[PDB]
Amino acid sequence: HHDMAGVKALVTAGGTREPLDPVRFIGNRSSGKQGYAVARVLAQRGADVTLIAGNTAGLIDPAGVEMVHIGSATQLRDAVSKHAPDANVLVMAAAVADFRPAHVAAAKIKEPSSIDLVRNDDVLAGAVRARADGQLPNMRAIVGFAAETGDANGDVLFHARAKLERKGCDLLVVNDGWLLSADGTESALEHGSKTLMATRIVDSIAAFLKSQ
């Protein structure tokens, strides 16, 4: 039915784009489909959903969901800062570009000089800090998303378990796939439609909120 009737949810989705100039930019391959799916499931279950979307070209805005379109990592951060205080749940599913062009050309660049890169702020960490400082009373649950690959140093779960504690979020969605909770619970995420996966994620949020 409607688990999320009283829940104000803030969802980010898609990838950000950091401009070199008006024409070109630095981006990633994020579709934002998973975040959109989570947005729809939440709204279907009675949540008041605000969705902040990055590069989602062919996706259609979900009905019953307040849409806030942004372009870059900075624009995303400012959007979150604006809408977070009213949110009970923050679903950080956007693929934020780690690096940004240090200087942006006013006009399209016409061998060229190298591009200087500067690190972007950790928007999630900003939210986690704000709640820790008592500046987010309404916030009850914070969800992070991560893509992990096995390397010589460790397993996928090995890296996933580490990132969950580093980010300081309550739940981490890892892509098969995993749902990692801060209490120490681990649930497998079987390959399926983005809809079914969204249901699993929202179920974890619901289950978490009951414990809150």
Ligand SMILES: Nc1ccn([C@@H]2O[C@H](COP(=O)(O)OP(=O)(O)OP(=O)(O)O)[C@@H](O)[C@H]2O)c(=O)n1
């Ligand atoms: N600048 C950033 C980068 C990440 N994220 C959020 O943090 C979570 C972790 O994403 P990930 O890129 O895997 O974490 P990183 O800190 O960037 O780790 P890594 O350097 O391995 O990519 C994601 O939900 C993402 O939305 C964020 O808010 N701000």
Ligand SMILES: [Mg+2]
């Ligand atoms: Mg990153």
